[PDB]
Design a protein around this ligand. Structure first.
Ligand SMILES: [Ca+2]
Ligand SMILES: [Ca+2]
Ligand SMILES: [Ca+2]
Ligand SMILES: [Ca+2]
Ligand SMILES: [Mg+2]
Ligand SMILES: [Mg+2]
Ligand SMILES: [Mg+2]
Ligand SMILES: [Mg+2]
Lengths: 387, 387, 387, 387
């Protein structure tokens, strides 16, 4: 049961299944993977495609002839399997040159290098068929208050994203950008730390229509926020261009557990919302198989990501379709929430004595919301315990 | 030393010094205060003014003749002392009718009542001279996933704020709105949970120029966020209309400690930023004297709010003016952060071999940022330990 | 399905279903309940019994004749229903006299009053048949560093618990004590903030055998801790005398959601551990029906507590009994974890070349733990998705 | 001013100043340091000594002749400078063999290897003059619930520590053990996650007198706990054998900032407590110079650790010595906190009508604690703002 197929649009970063297991306190526990092997093994599990940072596909420092050969071998693996590349991104965080940032480094020469490195990889992403170009500014931020003037850094961030938008327009590319928030780690505090901050920033760009968000489950949860609520605001804004799916157990280091692990009920409400809203983009997993695992465990963890999405999709659809749930939603006035407050207009509201002078506040206050019965029907559906 | 005067623009809510000490587990520890007594005692400490919820000034349910008398006595106290009223707000959270929200209650009749209650108090706020009208939607949100469709709630929130903007325009009022974020408490999750989310929402209103933020120190810190960074983004956007100052010790219930308490270094960097940016609005305290205190302790805690702001203002100004600090800022390339990345333009950047083909990445990576020396100069200034 | 009966040992505090809905920002949303009505309604849902604070059963300040009548009516309700009283406790936190603590108040006269108030209620608890007497020191702690010398406070805490142990021994009572940790709320920091701190403190009492812990799900989770791990340590120590079951969504104010809500996977692992260990005490719920609810919603939320325990008990038992899970546990070396490291003794270990000189560290490191496959079998069992 | 000397007992791990800057998302930013150079540079800053993991001093895998030469060169550097080695520890976390733990690995052969590796380094630690042997079980724990039976793991942990105590007794060594808690990172949850849990565990060892704690500032703060409160409980128990000093900004990844950074007021209250209690052990720093820094910045950050301790020591001593503070402490009844509750005994307390029957609860409740005035005197002392 719950078998994934390419039509489900599940995708994985090369760096996910390829993670060698180096952590803040430990050496690698697995050998490096050839990208060709990852494309083949993910296709065998029912994935739709893969994503990459520049430096995952082409080792940093490669000659032009070595670059050509790495791309040629990867394209053959895509052609052998039917796998797609819907998204790509730039590594602006591993190399020591990026220790104070890429686009917002205090050193101007590093900012210019970061833009040239990104532009080179936008060309490659378009050649491989990507629709979305992600930016995770993991080095943009500070450990101390004097190190980074945040207004100046936001000016540099806007300048960078405006130049990238000029570039893609000049080349006639159809690709769009997606900014990925994170609140902290590896910097003490990261700029644009949540979905809200990234959405607000985009409204100051010269061409806002070219930019949206790539929210990650565990990143919003590292600020103790409700991930489904933040996704709802992104959808409300028309800005959910891509998503990163994984798990996280509360406020700690970025765990990148397989999807479904961590906050299981939040995963349920997330899938319910994506499916109800008709989100059509990739279901992308940004996860780390724990370093306890061998290669067999890597593929088991990847398979589990897709399995858990499909279980949750079934249970959320059954919840929404149940006539007893539909009655409970009316008892809780979810239908009234979706009606305008005052389609009669401001003057009519001011002249309505039933809205103030003759409003029975005590009778309204006495009416229970019936939310606990609704939520226990949701629990029963998630757990397969309906009686 | 560090004596406040009205020119410092320190203001306090009636509900701050007037808090009777009821908490989630305990009864009141202090008698109610007459607003007239609070105006008098705050003026004697060097405050500039006071703010109010409707129901702090006029007991809920008052007749028109009782309302007139409560306002008359308050206006006499303002006239007796020279105290101002720069901000007012609505209580859309105490009465049981608001148990599922005001503007985003699932019950439509409660949404309409919430708007009429707000409009009545906007008229009073203008009569008393307020420049800013705050909205804290403390009941807007949920404990469970099915109870609140967040896209529908955001539609109702926008409708409410658009009607309020229509109202103030129709009356020719000069007053502006400020939305106050909070991530949780009293709801399990609150809508518009951070500065970023509120800034993004405002860009979808019909008249965005009429709306800004009222960020509170402790509320951003309840999400583990950097409060100075969020203030910098609000300033970058042109949206810092008002601020709430207090203290908070990390991720827990909303403590509302006196300003300076909680995260002392964050308080330093906050004052540094407000003063460097030339923020001109009220320095408003939203705090609770702990319920351990008697009335003498209430006034001691209020005095401490203002004293700590003035100490931090002195130390931040000395830091920025120190020639050794100015040299350290250049050593750390803060001057280069404020210069454009590519004022030469996109084509020049693409044709610059020094930005990619001939960029010496290893020499750039070897250059230390000197941030620890800069931060220890900042510590020495805060603590009065310069040698 | 999943119907509770008295034999399941589910119990509820009077103050749970009786919570009127006053929160840090809002007035009551429900009328007070007569304890007689709560005993009757809980019995009808399949509960085993009820628990009380002194002041829940007898209003504070009652005459001796009023006290007798309140106890008489309650005893009749217990006799009418077959309901038991396995635990009682003291309210040392609501009345303003306890604003700086009961047993660790800085005022000595308040410490002595707190002990007399507790002793009176121990006599009543024994008369009603309680086996456990809980202490939650919610007011013991501080908002500021100078207010409370913690070594002195721990001396006063030990003196109090030693006097209570002397009292119960002198009367020949069989009752035992259980200390309930909480990290914060209503104090900025509470003394004995976790299970570990309470276990360590007990080892310094004169009669340690008389004292154990009453851990609460949401309280350990307010420190971001793993509740099942802390329960395992309490069991290891022989000190799990009682437990409080509820839900919590991470690091925030104390939510007291119904059991099963909050961290669902942690609830699964908790039930697995209680059942595997043969815990025999009450399954007690310390929860708040949200203030959105009317009386029908109160009883629905109470019913849901018991239903979720029974669903999780079924799924955990099926996991442990599955032969495929038993094979996965051996593949992950859980059997080897339970074997002694060196039953051969220290000298044999020192003389064993296979433990150092001839140990093949690279072959051992290459062996995968197979934990992801084991955890996805656990997920499949929880969700009723086994194929 | 604030110049450290060896008599201040400041010590540093080799791995602190020697950290090359590899983080969860980035490569090294600094070359490796020779231990001889670190001993020399730290002595020049006024340090007292250094500490080491086995593998910091002797590269993993070294021949016996290479081991002898590494120790010989290090001993010469100690003799050249007068530097001491008061503490050492084992690296049971970097090598991939320890991916599921050392003492609590599910694989028995790894548990035995972990003990042999520790014993070899205890012999070396004694040869170099160490008084304390630290254990940080950073790999002991789990990412998932089925992977680790915590009762079985605690049995293996006790067996390991009991064997180490047998070993040191058999050799007639005077060295004692100190367990270092951490709540998470690199495991999803770590066993013995706080000071309380470690203190409780020690009471179950065969020879409890041989074991205490090594608490770290940032580790307790990763659980949102009050570090000074936890130190007070360790001191109350007689178990503060050693301490790790650093900074942390709330609930996130382990930052290991220089001491004084992070929560500055908590650092003040910590130093106040260590000095008031007469703690006599090393003032050890476990910190990371941020990877933004070059070698000059490494030594600046190390110097800042010691400077901040000495500033805070001065301010705390001035607070406690101020007659106005001494009067405020009496006004707040800190003197009464230190007096027994009932030195008259249980029967006298029961017969005292002033403790219950004739206790005026309303007069006691009306008495303010005066804690805000006391705390603003503490703020004024910290900031050098006394008027
Ligand atoms: Ca992540
Ligand atoms: Ca607040
Ligand atoms: Ca609770
Ligand atoms: Ca650390
Ligand atoms: Mg991601
Ligand atoms: Mg506020
Ligand atoms: Mg409880
Ligand atoms: Mg340490």
């Amino acid at each position: 049961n719950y078998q994934p197929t390419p039509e489900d649009r599940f995708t994985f970063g090369l760096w996910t299944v390829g993670w060698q297991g180096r952590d803040p306190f430990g050496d690698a526990t697995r050998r490096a993977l050839d990208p060709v092997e990852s494309v083949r093994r993910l296709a065998e599990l029912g994935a739709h495609g893969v994503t990459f940072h520049d430096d995952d596909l082409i080792p940093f420092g490669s000659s032009d002839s070595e670059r050509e050969e790495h791309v040629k071998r990867f394209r053959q693996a895509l052609d052998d399997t039917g796998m797609k590349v819907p998204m790509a991104t730039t590594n602006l965080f591993t190399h020591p040159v990026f220790k104070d940032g890429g686009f917002t480094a205090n050193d101007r020469d590093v900012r210019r290098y970061a833009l040239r490195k990104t532009i080179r990889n936008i060309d490659l992403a378009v050649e491989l068929g990507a629709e979305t170009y992600v930016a995770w500014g993991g080095r943009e931020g500070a450990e101390s208050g004097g190190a980074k003037d945040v207004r100046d850094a936001l000016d540099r961030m806007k300048e960078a994203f405006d130049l990238l938008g000029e570039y893609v327009t000049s080349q006639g590319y159809d690709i769009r950008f997606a900014i990925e928030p994170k609140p902290n780690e590896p910097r003490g505090d990261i700029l644009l730390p949540t979905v809200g901050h990234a959405l607000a920033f985009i409204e100051r760009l010269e061409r806002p229509e070219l930019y949206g968000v790539n929210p990650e489950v565990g990143h919003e949860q590292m600020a103790g926020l409700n991930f489904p609520h933040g996704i709802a605001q992104a959808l409300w804004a028309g800005k959910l261009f891509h998503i990163d799916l994984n798990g996280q157990n509360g406020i700690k280091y970025d765990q990148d557990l397989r999807f479904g692990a961590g906050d299981l009920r939040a995963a349920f409400w997330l899938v319910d919302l994506l499916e109800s809203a008709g989100y059509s983009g990739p279901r992308h997993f940004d996860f780390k198989p724990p370093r306890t695992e061998d290669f067999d465990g890597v593929w088991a963890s990847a398979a589990g990501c897709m399995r858990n999405y499909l279980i949750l999709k079934e249970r959320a659809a059954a919840f929404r379709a149940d006539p007893e749930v539909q009655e409970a939603l009316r008892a809780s006035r979810l239908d009234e929430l979706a009606r305008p407050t005052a389609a009669d207009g401001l003057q009519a509201l001011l002249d309505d004595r039933s809205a103030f002078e003759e409003f029975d506040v005590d009778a309204a206050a006495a009416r229970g919301m019936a939310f606990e019965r609704l939520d226990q029907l949701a629990m029963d559906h998630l757990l397969g315990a309906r009686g």
